[PDB]
Write an enzyme that holds these catalytic residues in place. Structure first.
Site, PDB file in Angstrom:
ATOM      1  N   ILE A  59       0.823  -1.230   0.000  1.00  0.00           N
ATOM      2  CA  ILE A  59       0.000   0.000   0.000  1.00  0.00           C
ATOM      3  C   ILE A  59       0.851   1.272   0.000  1.00  0.00           C
ATOM      4  CG2 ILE A  59      -0.179  -0.249   2.511  1.00  0.00           C
ATOM      5  CD1 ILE A  59      -2.907   1.203   2.255  1.00  0.00           C
ATOM      6  N   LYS A 117       5.706   3.791   0.776  1.00  0.00           N
ATOM      7  CA  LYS A 117       5.200   2.421   0.572  1.00  0.00           C
ATOM      8  C   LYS A 117       5.321   1.607   1.832  1.00  0.00           C
ATOM      9  CE  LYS A 117       7.691  -0.414  -2.029  1.00  0.00           C
ATOM     10  NZ  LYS A 117       8.316  -0.699  -3.354  1.00  0.00           N
ATOM     11  N   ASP A 150      12.955  -6.886 -14.806  1.00  0.00           N
ATOM     12  CA  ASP A 150      11.506  -6.900 -14.735  1.00  0.00           C
ATOM     13  C   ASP A 150      10.814  -5.641 -15.264  1.00  0.00           C
ATOM     14  OD1 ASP A 150       8.995  -7.686 -14.145  1.00  0.00           O
ATOM     15  OD2 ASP A 150       9.232  -7.560 -11.979  1.00  0.00           O
TER      16      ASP A 150
END
EC number: 2.7.11.24
Length: 335
Positions: free
Chosen positions: A39, A55, A152
Site C-alpha cells: 500500500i 510504501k 523486470d
C-alpha cells in the site's frame, strides 16, 4: 476525526497512525496530515518540506526471499544516484525495535506511471514518446554500468511526472508478467545479459505506440509463439547458443515468417520502427546495445553522450533486519 483520513498520534506523539480502511499506516510524526493513499501513500515531510511516496511493506520479515527482495531494493536504490532512477528519500524506523514487522520506504513523489498513461488512452507528442524512451535507456545505461540488470521492466515500473521526467523503480533480480520477457529468459539457459532489459524496452515502446501489449501471452509457450509470429524463425543454428533442450523445441516449431513492423504499425515513426526492430531480435548477441540505441537517429535530438553518465563504482541472512534498521537509523538520527 478532522482530517478526512483518520489520523492519531502514537508513541509519545513521535509517530502517527493513519487508518486507511482497517489496515493502518504508521509513520514518523514528521509526516503530518493530510496524506493521500495512491500500500502506497502520498505524504509531505514537514521538516524537509519535500513530498514523498511512502510504501508500506507488511510482514517483510515473515519470509526469507521477501526479506532479501526488500533488503536489495533498499541497498540497490541507495547505491544508485541518477535522475532516471527513483531515489529513496526516507526509511522509517520501527516504533519499538522488537516489534519490527512492517517496513515503510519513502521514495520521491511521482505523479503517475507509464502503465497508467497507456491505459488512460491520452495522446502524446512524438517528442514525449521520444523523451520517455531516451530516459529509460539513459537510466538503464547507468544501472548496467553498475553491473545490475533490472530484469523486470514493464510500464508500471516506469514512474512519470507532469514534467514528463521518467524514473525507473522496482528493482531486483540482477547480478508474474511474461509479456516483457526476452526469448532467452523464456527458455531458461540461466546465462543471460543486459540484452534482456533491451528486449523489455522494445516491448514497452511498442506498447506505448500501439496502446496494447505487443506480446500478450497466456502461458510460457504462447508467449514464444507470439514472439515468433512477429520476429520470424531464427537462423537454423547460427542464431542459437542456448541449451539443446530448447533448441530442439524451437526446431520443432512451425516456420514463422517475419512480419514487417512498419506494415503492422503504419502509424508510428519509421526511425522508431528501425530502432525497435533492432531491439527485438531473437539472438541477444545480435540485439542492439543500450549504447548504440542511445546513439540511434530516433534519439539524436536528445542524444548527448556527455550527459549520459555511468556508475562510478559497481555494486556488491535473517538479521538483515538489523541492516534495514541501521539504514533507517541513518535516515533518522533522532531515534
Amino acid at each position: 476525526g478532522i482530517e478526512n483520513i483518520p489520523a492519531t498520534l502514537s508513541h509519545g506523539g513521535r509517530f502517527i497512525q493513519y487508518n486507511i480502511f482497517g489496515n493502518i499506516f504508521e509513520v514518523t510524526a514528521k509526516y503530518k496530515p493530510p496524506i493521500m493513499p495512491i500500500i502506497v501513500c502520498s505524504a509531505m515531510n514537514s521538516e524537509t518540506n519535500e513530498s514523498v511516496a511512502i510504501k508500506k511493506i507488511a510482514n517483510a520479515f515473515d519470509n526469507k526471499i521477501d526479506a532479501k527482495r526488500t533488503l536489495r531494493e533498499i541497498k540497490l536504490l541507495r547505491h544508485m544516484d541518477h535522475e532516471n532512477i527513483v531515489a529513496i528519500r526516507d526509511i522509517i524506523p520501527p516504533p519499538l525495535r522488537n516489534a519490527f514487522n512492517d517496513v515503510y520506504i519513502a521514495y520521491e513523489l511521482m505523479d503517475t506511471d507509464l502503465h497508467q498513461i497507456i491505459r488512460s488512452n491520452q495522446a502524446l507528442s512524438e517528442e514525449h514518446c521520444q523523451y520517455f524512451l531516451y530516459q529509460i535507456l539513459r537510466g538503464l545505461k547507468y544501472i548496467h554500468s553498475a553491473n545490475v540488470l533490472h530484469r523486470d521492466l514493464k510500464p508500471s515500473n516506469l514512474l512519470l511526472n507532469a514534467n514528463c521526467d521518467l524514473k525507473i523503480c522496482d528493482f531486483g533480480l540482477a547480478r508474474v508478467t511474461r509479456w516483457y520477457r526476452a526469448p532467452e529468459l523464456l527458455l531458461n539457459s540461466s546465462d543471460y545479459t543486459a540484452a534482456i532489459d533491451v528486449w523489455s524496452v522494445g516491448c514497452i515502446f511498442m506498447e506505448l505506440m500501439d496502446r496494447k501489449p505487443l506480446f500478450p501471452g497466456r502461458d510460457h509457450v504462447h508467449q514464444l509463439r507470439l514472439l515468433m509470429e512477429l520476429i520470424g524463425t531464427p537462423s537454423e543454428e547460427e542464431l542459437e547458443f542456448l541449451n539443446e533442450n530448447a533448441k530442439r523445441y524451437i526446431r520443432q516449431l512451425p516456420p514463422y515468417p517475419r512480419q514487417s513492423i512498419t506494415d503492422k504499425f503504419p502509424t508510428v515513426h519509421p526511425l522508431a520502427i528501425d530502432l525497435i526492430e533492432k531491439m527485438l531480435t531473437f539472438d541477444p548477441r545480435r540485439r542492439i546495445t543500450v549504447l548504440d540505441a542511445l546513439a540511434h537517429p530516433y534519439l539524436n535530438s536528445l542524444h548527448d553522450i556527455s550527459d549520459e553518465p555511468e556508475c562510478t563504482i559497481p555494486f556488491n541472512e535473517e538479521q538483515m533486519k538489523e541492516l534495514i534498521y541501521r539504514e533507517a537509523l541513518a535516515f533518522n538520527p533522532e531515534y
